[PDB]
């Protein structure tokens, strides 16, 4: 007998799967579809205080090894997602995360002040997007978390861009550990500012920023696993959510082995739609069956070093 159940943040989740923020979670229809899916949870599109059109198109391109995008935070605005969380989400089906991505400290502070009562009343959980990106400037990062912690009377998580050396893992973890309200860390947002060139057209493939954009998919799995495990080790008091390169149950298995509690799906979900979650739960159970595991706790964070 097996189970994908996860228990964390005073909630129970049927399985660890959820969408990545930015993917299939912008409109009412999308949020409802995520709620009706087999996913264990969902997160609403990273929001700004007011609606944002986002960058000019094309701004997303699917690729053999993943995706590249420079969406530019298109979203319906904070009021919209707050109302979804306050009055529409069926918390009886699954828990809900709200992703917040204010463009200044002030914006985050203002939104958090209003989110507080809805979190208290309904149980929505904040995922604060820190992905130059806030998390790549340690002073800006400390300031952001100080501000939010000061005005937001609840636990929350942070969505991180990837780091690429131990000095940075140490520096980031030192900061995160100074904030006990940060109860989860989502690793990772894209690998930033890659450049895809189409040999046939001799051109870039997205319009904004001269073709530079965030990489997702197969490209990022080892970087994601690195960041998941690095923070799993360095922030023992916190949960880690995995994000990056999940297409299969086996991929998800790797995230959990590295330390992941929840596993977010981006590029693969963009291409397949919310039905992917039935496939992913099935595949992960199958991997666990073949390896003789009954629960996620049996192998979470147990990757073997040499």
Ligand X SMILES: Cc1cc2nc3c(=O)[nH]c(=O)nc-3n(C[C@H](O)[C@H](O)[C@H](O)COP(=O)(O)O)c2cc1C
Give the annotated binding-site residues. Answer: 21, 45-46, 69, 71-73, 129, 159, 188-190, 217, 243, 245, 266-267
Q: Compute the least distance from the CB of residue 128 to a second copy, in Å.
A: 19
Residue 305 CA to residue 229 CA, distance in Å, equals 12
Choose, by CB under 6 A, the member of 55, 67, 70, 108 that binds ligand X: 67
Residue 158 CA to residue 147 CA, distance in Å, equals 14
15 interacts with ligand X by CB under 6 A:
no
Instruction: State the binding partner of 55 from ligand X, a second copy, none, CB within 5 to 8 A by kind.
Output: none
Choose, by CB under 8 A, the member of 197, 278, 282, 289 that binds a second copy: 197
Residue 227 CA to residue 232 CA, distance in Å, equals 8
**Helix spans in 152-219 (H):** 166-177
* Widest Cα–Cα separation across the chain: 55
Which residue minimizes CB distance to ligand X?
A: 22
Q: Which of 164, 214, 209, 155 minimizes the C-alpha distance to 20? A: 214
Beta bridge partners of 128: 100, 158
Residue 243 CA to residue 83 CA, distance in Å, equals 26
Choose, by CB under 6 A, the member of 39, 76, 108, 267 that binds ligand X: 267
Residue 28 CA to residue 44 CA, distance in Å, equals 10
C-beta neighbour count of 64 within 10 angstroms: 6
88 interacts with a second copy by CB under 8 A:
no
Q: Compute the least distance from the CB of residue 79 to ligand X, in Å.
A: 17
Choose, by CB under 8 A, the member of 51, 93, 136, 181 that binds a second copy: 136
Residue 135 CA to residue 188 CA, distance in Å, equals 11
Non-local (6+) Cβ contacts of 132 within 8 A are 140
Q: Compute the least distance from the CB of residue 225 to a second copy, in Å.
A: 4
196 interacts with a second copy by CB under 8 A:
yes
Q: Compute the least distance from the CB of residue 125 to a second copy, in Å.
A: 27
- Yes or no: say if 13 and 253 are a contact pair by the CB < 8 Å rule: no
Contacting range for ligand X; rule: CB under 6 A; set: 14-22, 90-98, 102-110, 117-125 = 14-22
- Yes or no: say if 222 and 255 are a contact pair by the CB < 8 Å rule: no
Q: Compute the least distance from the CB of residue 78 to ligand X, in Å.
A: 13
For residues 115 to 144, the per-residue mask of contacts with ligand X, x marking binding by CB under 6 A and - elsewhere, is --------------x-x-------------
- Yes or no: say if 101 and 111 are a contact pair by the CB < 8 Å rule: no
- Yes or no: say if 69 and 45 are a contact pair by the CB < 8 Å rule: no
Instruction: State the binding partner of 206 from a second copy, ligand X, none, CB within 5 to 8 A by kind.
Output: a second copy
Choose, by CB under 6 A, the member of 52, 94, 159, 238 that binds ligand X: 159
User: Between residues 6 and 230, which has the closer beta carbon with respect to a second copy?
Assistant: 230
Q: Give me the residues that bind ligand X (CB under 6 A), please.
A: 20-23, 45-46, 60, 67, 69, 71, 99, 129, 131, 159, 189-190, 216-217, 220, 243-246, 265-267, 270
């Amino acid at each position: 007998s097996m189970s994908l159940q996860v228990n964390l943040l005073n909630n129970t989740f049927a399985n660890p799967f959820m969408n990545a923020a930015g993917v299939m979670c912008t409109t009412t229809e999308e949020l409802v579809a995520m709620t009706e899916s087999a996913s264990g949870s969902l997160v609403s599109k990273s929001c700004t205080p007011a609606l944002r059109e986002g960058n000019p198109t094309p701004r997303y391109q699917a690729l053999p090894l993943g995706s590249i995008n420079s969406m530019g935070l298109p979203n319906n605005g904070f009021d919209f997602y707050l109302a979804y969380a306050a009055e529409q989400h069926d918390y009886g089906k699954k828990p809900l995360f709200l992703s917040m991505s204010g463009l200044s400290m002030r914006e985050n502070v203002e939104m958090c002040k209003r989110l507080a009562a809805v979190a208290t009343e309904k149980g929505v959980i904040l995922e604060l997007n820190l992905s130059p990106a806030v998390a790549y400037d340690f002073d800006a990062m400390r300031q952001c978390l100080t501000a939010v912690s000061e005005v937001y009377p609840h636990s929350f998580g942070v969505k991180m861009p990837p780091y690429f050396d131990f000095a940075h893992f140490d520096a980031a973890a030192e900061i995160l550990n100074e904030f006990p309200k940060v109860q989860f860390i989502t690793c990772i947002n894209s690998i930033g500012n890659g450049l895809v060139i189409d040999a046939e057209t001799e051109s870039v493939v997205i319009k904004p920023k001269q073709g530079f954009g965030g990489l997702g998919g197969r490209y990022v799995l080892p970087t994601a696993l690195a960041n998941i495990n690095a923070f799993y080790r360095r922030c023992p008091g916190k949960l880690i959510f995995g994000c990056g390169g999940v297409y299969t149950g086996e991929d998800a298995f790797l995230h959990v082995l590295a330390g992941a509690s929840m596993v977010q799906v981006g590029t693969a979900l963009q291409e397949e739609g919310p039905s992917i979650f039935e496939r992913l739960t099935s595949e992960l159970l199958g991997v666990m069956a073949k390896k003789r595991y009954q629960t996620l706790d049996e192998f979470r964070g147990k990757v073997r070093t040499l």
